[PDB]
Design a protein around this ligand. Structure first.
Ligand code: NA
Length: 388
């Protein structure tokens, strides 16, 4: 009842929202200063950073402290269909975002601040982000269902983590092997997931796949999740790197097959990734359609390597150096990530001769795992649907 008191804080479990109109909701966020009120606290600003929203040309506004309390509060508006992740940035600095600002001023600003990002401690839905700070989930009421995520179930057989020591790549990484449905299942499709460490540890997919397979949305299957190791490895290995996929095919999969047998049918073999991983996943089906006949690409980085020039994959597809023949593809991108959107549309245009084998999807979200988690499940559902 009295704002900022223990009992008041008790009633707070993350942001609260209410409809403004048909299109928008108003949303309020609270952060509690561990250090107490103005007198006792060194905190000068708290920034709310919302993925795909905070980035998109006016001056950022801080949370404001309610005078005399440990409460910081900030209100904004969000689209009814929107879902995405956010973080708080409590900082002792007062120099960032003072000017009334250039697009590059903004980016620089957030670059300086993002190292101090934290998840909302009162939001139960928080995870270690992909960018070395924790984040929290926010979903507006009309955001679409994400298959399986609302009714996770304990895995029947927990995933096995092995170390894959690659002779070709001269490195070691974690691989997680997870099998679903009935043990005796024969000719189980294989799905390979890039950024495996994220989907194995940060936002574990196990209980969601379990849930969907139990209700026969997904066939019994073998999932192989590959650790990207770190940012540098990832940026070398994922974007169009033949040696990565030759190692995967010649060393990793034959190991996985003796531990967890799966089908050698390309037409049910899935390769799934996001950004560099989506690009990688397509690159794999274009060059080894005998092994990978199904591609799940979400927010694929089709601009690669050019951070106003076509990406190399698109160029090689234009030139007929590679064909998308013998492929089923889920191709997904968010509207709140405009440059990714454009690259994906350019690819889609190019894939015209193979247009009807493509599940083309747009989304009200950004470059954000909270959005991807749904499209990942739905994409696996679409690709495997002919097995039903
Ligand atoms: Na639930």
């Amino acid at each position: 009842l009295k704002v900022g008191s223990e009992s008041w804080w008790q009633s707070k479990h993350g942001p609260e929202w209410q409809r403004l109109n048909d299109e928008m909701f108003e949303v309020t966020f609270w952060w509690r200063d561990p250090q107490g009120s103005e007198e006792y606290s060194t905190i000068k600003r708290v920034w709310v950073y919302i993925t795909g929203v905070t980035d998109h040309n006016s001056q950022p506004q801080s949370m404001q402290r309610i005078a005399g309390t440990d409460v910081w509060q900030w209100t904004t508006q969000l689209n009814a269909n929107w879902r995405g992740s956010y973080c708080f940035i409590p900082t002792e600095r007062d120099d960032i975002f003072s000017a009334p600002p250039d697009r590059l001023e903004l980016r620089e600003g957030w670059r300086k601040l993002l190292p101090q990002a934290i998840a909302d401690p009162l939001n139960p839905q928080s995870w270690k982000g992909g960018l070395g700070h924790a984040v929290s989930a926010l979903e507006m009421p009309q955001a679409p269902l994400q298959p399986g995520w609302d009714c996770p179930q304990a895995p029947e057989i927990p995933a096995k983590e092995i170390i894959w020591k690659s002779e070709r790549l001269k490195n070691s990484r974690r691989v997680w092997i997870f099998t679903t449905g009935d043990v005796t299942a024969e000719e189980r499709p294989l799905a390979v997931l890039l950024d495996g460490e994220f989907w194995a540890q940060s936002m574990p997919v196990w209980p969601v796949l379990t849930s969907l397979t139990h209700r026969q949305q997904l066939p019994p299957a073998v999932y192989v999740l590959i650790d990207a190791i770190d940012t540098t490895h990832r940026a070398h290995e994922l974007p169009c790197n033949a040696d990565f996929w030759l190692a995967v095919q010649q060393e990793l999969l034959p190991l996985v097959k003796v531990i967890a047998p799966f089908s050698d049918r390309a037409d049910r073999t899935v390769v799934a990734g996001q950004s560099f991983g989506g690009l990688s996943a397509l690159y794999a089906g274009l060059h080894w359609p005998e092994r990978f006949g199904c591609v799940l690409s979400q927010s694929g980085s089709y601009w690669w390597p050019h951070r106003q020039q076509e990406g190399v994959l698109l160029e090689k597809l234009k030139a007929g150096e590679v064909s998308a023949e013998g492929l089923r593809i889920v191709l997904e991108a968010g509207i709140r990530e405009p440059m990714i959107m454009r690259a994906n549309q350019a690819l889609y245009a190019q894939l015209h001769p193979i247009k009807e084998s493509i599940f083309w999807r747009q989304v009200d979200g950004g470059h954000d795992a909270l959005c991807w988690r749904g499209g990942l499940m739905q994409g696996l559902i679409d690709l495997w649907q002919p097995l039903f």
